[PDB]
Structure 1
């Protein structure tokens, strides 16, 4: 309602913000927001745009575009009378004769809705839909455009019961406009409906046939925007309403196949999406088949680089990306049955004199690798050495997929005599790691990481050569690539294992690894993949990590505390402080688990002068069953490594371990069971008070059906470990637990765990020689499994097998040992004197 020197001061203000130089431009925009606080300001802004026609379009339009930003911040500050003025004005001038003004009017309505949120503009929708029937094109198109953006922004909210259900009238209204005379209008009509396909709104699904009918009718439209939208709708219709789309499938795929090759970039990429979406559906294998001979070449043709990407090298989602993505997933559907259609193409492609073609051939070779692996094997003897040659190709992009494609037959390559395929590959991929092109480094280092996962121990003779080129990469690698190098190094250690543990190698690897460790802030986003990397390296280097373990330990304990303190605050600050990422805790716990597991005794010094056990106790209670899981593992690891610092806590830990002995959480319970077992052996006779709390559950878990064998095995190991240090509490149970205990431990190898467990069964039997006599047939089979028992544990088995044959007689035992296989009977007779 304003005037008039102020209007002139705003007009001059609008003028100045359009000036040539940036000096005057970005000093006036200050005054534009010092008035911004006064809500009366916006009344001028809307006026200039919509009423003050005595001014040029650029000025007026800017005014509304200034007003837009005044909504995108302190709209909560917008008074009711001001908003009601803008709403009113915008909704009237919606179809202004001017293009730019109308565009400005539009975007203003949109933003007021999105922030309005949204029952706060009740008239909006029914008034827009009304203007859809307006006789003027401009008002109608402008209304339709506004509606489309409202759908795009607020589909789930229009669909939601929050604004009632306005779609129950918008949808069947939109469908009628599919028939409209204007190419632009039809476009909007379908674009709007498309939003409510996946969300499968009933307002639409109960008009599916009407929709599909209309959709078919628009398939042949010559305006690209319509065809784009029709395609998007059909693709989407795939996931949701296969039922009604089925008895058209062949017509559809003939349309889509044609439409994949459409002249318009956008239509093509949308149509191509159809093939990716279809592949995922069960009713695919038996539908496409007859189309593969025409689909495959079209798909392979799209996989070539676009002139644009070529120049932008030597986006997230190309035709080529989608085209290959589809091919990969198809190769998985059709397996070797796909080869006939692809194989004769590769012939012509992999040797083609234009590099852009060759590249795509190489990319094809890679995509089909998973599903067609078995059928490709006869050609790999020619193909593998050919690609190894291509790595030396002058075009960088030809080198890069070659790395990736080779990485995708990395399993077959190791399945051969190492000098013939693996060794050449290895050497060449190593040179490519230090390629001068970033894209090729990314590729080769990646591929090599992949290769290492498949090689493991087959790299051992090449270690000195791997490391040499791997550490040099440090003083070359950017960041995107550096991150992959951490992976390359991590995997290397994960492959060779203790083979890396040599003075010479540590001299090269650790210094620049610990150098990068230093210049990482606790907040730096590189710790993420570097903890994973040093976690691996520590494990492999075992005790040899000692001189470098100082800082990695303390920085981890920090993280564990950081995350817990973070979490605590979040329990009362879900407005102030943010929920922490608990995966950082989990890696730190695991890295700590591995430092204790690899440095054994030596960790004591670091465990002592830290709150490691405090935090650990807090971690064993965290709501997330991954944290409790990882931290129970650390408990066992610390019990084993330096029990001296743990002991003054066994009072607190045992209860939590007791209440955390729940089989529904497998990994959690496993590590809980395992911790207990590890503790009892260290506690000796002092472990007595804690027996009854955990024992009754462990016997229930061991006599439980459908239990992962490793949890069952660990329980059997743990139970035995208690009845070795405190046999008086565990031995009176033998009857109920002897059956699955023997059934479990007969399959585990003759390792320290097995000995510890059987030493304990023997002790329990010596004290309770009654519980076993009922099911002694199992005790034989459990003892029969031993290939290499220890001198004394031998004598322990005799004492039992003998004295408990003497307790039954010579003729009873004969009859007892009938059900014995030749390996078993002849074994117990050869080992223990029958």
Structure 2
């Protein structure tokens, strides 16, 4: 209806929008974004597209596409008459003779359904399914092309009851068109039907057999698009209806082997996704047996690079990537049983003079490692030094994936004595950490970190060279590589422990780290691995970290507080206040815990002048249990380091621990139970009020069956410590816990924790011996677990044992000790005077 004048100036505007020079283009678009705010404009756009057939097809289409963008944004304020007019024009004129016009109309229909929503245009689905039978191929083709994108956008919408589920006609209506003469039609049909498989929508599950039959009929179509979509369909079926597909499986996999070799990359990629998805299934192991000899070479050949990847480098998902993942899974499934089909390719690939072939070989060697390790062992004496040598190859990609492969054989490398394989590997690998190509830097540093997790103490002779190359890496690593260098340094620190605590190493390492720390910002993204790095470094250096702990402490306090403020704003009103990643706060808390434990009372000048106790109190009831775990650990370490700052808040903390003393959160409950013990020892007799609110819970916990060893040990130790500082309150309870207490602590080292716990059990025996007299054999067993007790604790054991011997009498003690095992009897006898 809108027509005549103004249309000349709109045609002028379109001509201007098609300007050759950018200057007019990027000065005309302002006029367009001023005109969108007048909804009548859209009538002229759809009119130019649909009806002004005297103007050229590009201009008409461009009008349509401008109208597309006007729907992509601020479609909210479109008038109902305008929307109905565009709906009507597009949906009537779907099969225009020009394919460009046809596709413009298709994307208009798509966008008008994608923005907005389907139930605001509900006649669309029936109306264009009725056009689907049309005798004009173009109208049928365009209707299907729109349908496909509607399905791709809105699968879980049509599955839901929000539109009375029109799928129930669409699915069979589609299924009829698998038969159709045109390959494009068949492609659209199966592409529509594919979207609903994983949703396992009922409308398709109830025709699964018709669907599978039409797939088998299409299997022989030498059109690539059809085979692509059929591969996607068969991939999805492996996940959902494995049961219905199983009887046919051998034919399927023969087809899919011929399809993975197919001369098109996309077809091949889907056919390989097939193998990846199948190898995950539990039935697989017996399925592929008669095809593995034909499958494995196809995957190996796929693991070569394409020439296109060669030229690009010197994608996120490739045929190579998928083939290698499939081979890794097949390795983990068949273990050693895979080797006879793959080793003969290896001993050819690995020595080839075409470097890409050699590369595919090293990659295959790495990919099978996890599953095939045991059967690979007798060849590693040849392979590992060859891989070392390949770290010298002129082509960088070889060096990179060789680093990774060696990393995946680290466990065997460290089992052999250091001079054989480990020292050569480490020398060459440190050398290539300083390689000139960033790919090699990344791969070498990652492989080296992976190695350092397993070399452990064996690294200490090399620390000088290690730290030299590492601290030098700070100057060359620009972006991504620097983060992995933090990972490597943290792994080195965790791997060697206190053997790093020497001032020359500190002088090498701390200046660049503290530089990066000071110049990194609260809102930055690099400092997460650096926090983990410094947690490792400080936990290893302990007291040697003292000159550097100021900025990290204040920064971490800031992180915890900022996280808590963001979380508050989020819990009050989410729309403007997105929640923070509490991982930052968790690593900050763990790092402060390590600082306290490693530096001791030297942390007082930082605990005093900071709100760390307020923030910690703010953490201990956070609904994420890892936060609570970290916070209780930090509570205990502050208790140990400088309790004078903590003593005023004990009345606030102790009830919270009384609430969270709960073993269904094992990891949390451990640290909480332990903090109670450290706190009781620092408080002393002042603990009398807080004993009953925790004692019943501890007694329940230690008697819990099938409970992990660490929690049980810490529970017993804390019970003993509370009994040490408050014996009257705990003493009536020994009847109920002495048996598992000794069953646990008989296994633990003679550290100060055990000393505190046994001082506690002795102090409690001095108030109530009966609760031990009930079970005294287990106390004898536990005391026998002591190798080197303190002299006064040894006197206390003597006084208990003799006092109970004189209570029971000589002949009764004889019978009571007759069935001790010999080490028990004899240690107890010699060490305490029988």
TM-score (norm 2): 0.99
Deviation by residue 1:379-406 (Cα, 9 ceiling, x = unmatched): 0001000110000001111111110111
- Alignment partners' CA distance in 1, 2:94 and 2:805: 101
Deviation by residue 1:230-253 (Cα, 9 ceiling, x = unmatched): 111111110111111111111111
**Structure 1 residue runs without a partner (length 5+):** none
Deviation by residue 1:649-670 (Cα, 9 ceiling, x = unmatched): 0010000000111111111111
- Alignment partners' CA distance in 1, 2:47 and 2:491: 66
1:527 is aligned to 527
- Alignment partners' CA distance in 2, 1:118 and 1:755: 72
The alpha carbon displacement at 1:827 in A equals 1.0
The alpha carbon displacement at 1:5 in A equals 2.8
Deviation by residue 1:496-552 (Cα, 9 ceiling, x = unmatched): 111111100111111111111122121111111111111111111111111111111
Deviation by residue 1:658-715 (Cα, 9 ceiling, x = unmatched): 0111111111111111111010000001111111101111011111222212111111
The alpha carbon displacement at 1:222 in A equals 1.1
Deviation by residue 1:771-810 (Cα, 9 ceiling, x = unmatched): 1111111110111111111111111101001110000101
- Alignment partners' CA distance in 1, 2:161 and 2:528: 42
Deviation by residue 1:709-767 (Cα, 9 ceiling, x = unmatched): 21111110001000111111011111111111111111111111111100000000011
Deviation by residue 1:126-176 (Cα, 9 ceiling, x = unmatched): 112111111111111100010000111111111112222111111111111
- Alignment partners' CA distance in 2, 1:591 and 1:85: 64
The alpha carbon displacement at 1:14 in A equals 1.1
1:494 is aligned to 494
The alpha carbon displacement at 1:319 in A equals 0.6
Map 1:24-39 onto structure 2 (within 5 A).
24-39=24-39
Deviation by residue 1:257-292 (Cα, 9 ceiling, x = unmatched): 111101111111111111111111111111111111
The alpha carbon displacement at 1:315 in A equals 0.6
Deviation by residue 1:90-109 (Cα, 9 ceiling, x = unmatched): 11111111111111100111
The alpha carbon displacement at 1:478 in A equals 2.1
Please, which moves more after superposition, 4-13 or 16-25?
4-13
- Alignment partners' CA distance in 1, 2:681 and 2:6: 87
The alpha carbon displacement at 1:819 in A equals 2.3
The alpha carbon displacement at 1:3 in A equals 3.1
- Alignment partners' CA distance in 2, 1:33 and 1:568: 40
SS of alignment partner, residue 420 of structure 1:
helix
Please, which moves more after superposition, 417-426 or 522-531?
522-531
- Alignment partners' CA distance in 2, 1:359 and 1:792: 67
The alpha carbon displacement at 1:118 in A equals 2.3
- Alignment partners' CA distance in 2, 1:547 and 1:78: 66
Q: Does 1:348 align with 2:348?
A: yes
Deviation by residue 1:323-368 (Cα, 9 ceiling, x = unmatched): 1111110011110010000011111110011001000011010001
Map 1:149-168 onto structure 2 (within 5 A).
149-168=149-168
- Alignment partners' CA distance in 2, 1:153 and 1:478: 40
Please, which moves more after superposition, 117-126 or 175-184?
117-126
Please, which moves more after superposition, 808-817 or 570-579?
570-579
- Alignment partners' CA distance in 1, 2:705 and 2:366: 45
Please, which moves more after superposition, 160-169 or 681-690?
160-169
Please, which moves more after superposition, 577-586 or 364-373?
577-586
The runs of 4+ residues in structure 1 deviating greater than 6 Å are: none
- Alignment partners' CA distance in 2, 1:137 and 1:477: 59
Q: How many residues align?
A: 834
The alpha carbon displacement at 1:450 in A equals 0.7
Deviation by residue 1:589-629 (Cα, 9 ceiling, x = unmatched): 11111111111111111110011000100100111111111
The alpha carbon displacement at 1:121 in A equals 1.1
SS of alignment partner, residue 3 of structure 1:
coil
2:384 is aligned to 384
Map 1:231-380 onto structure 2 (within 5 A).
231-380=231-380
SS of alignment partner, residue 196 of structure 1:
coil
SS of alignment partner, residue 819 of structure 2:
coil
Root-mean-square deviation (CA), in Å? 0.9
Q: Does 1:647 align with 2:647?
A: yes
Please, which moves more after superposition, 614-623 or 703-712?
703-712
SS of alignment partner, residue 418 of structure 2:
coil
1:675 is aligned to 675
Please, which moves more after superposition, 346-355 or 705-714?
705-714
**Structure 2 residue runs without a partner (length 5+):** none
Q: Does 1:192 align with 2:192?
A: yes
- Alignment partners' CA distance in 2, 1:118 and 1:672: 53
SS of alignment partner, residue 115 of structure 2:
helix
TM-score (norm 1): 0.99
- Alignment partners' CA distance in 2, 1:383 and 1:325: 22
The alpha carbon displacement at 1:4 in A equals 3.1
- Alignment partners' CA distance in 2, 1:555 and 1:715: 34
- Alignment partners' CA distance in 2, 1:755 and 1:164: 72
1:456 is aligned to 456
The alpha carbon displacement at 1:27 in A equals 1.0
1:475 is aligned to 475
The alpha carbon displacement at 1:38 in A equals 1.2
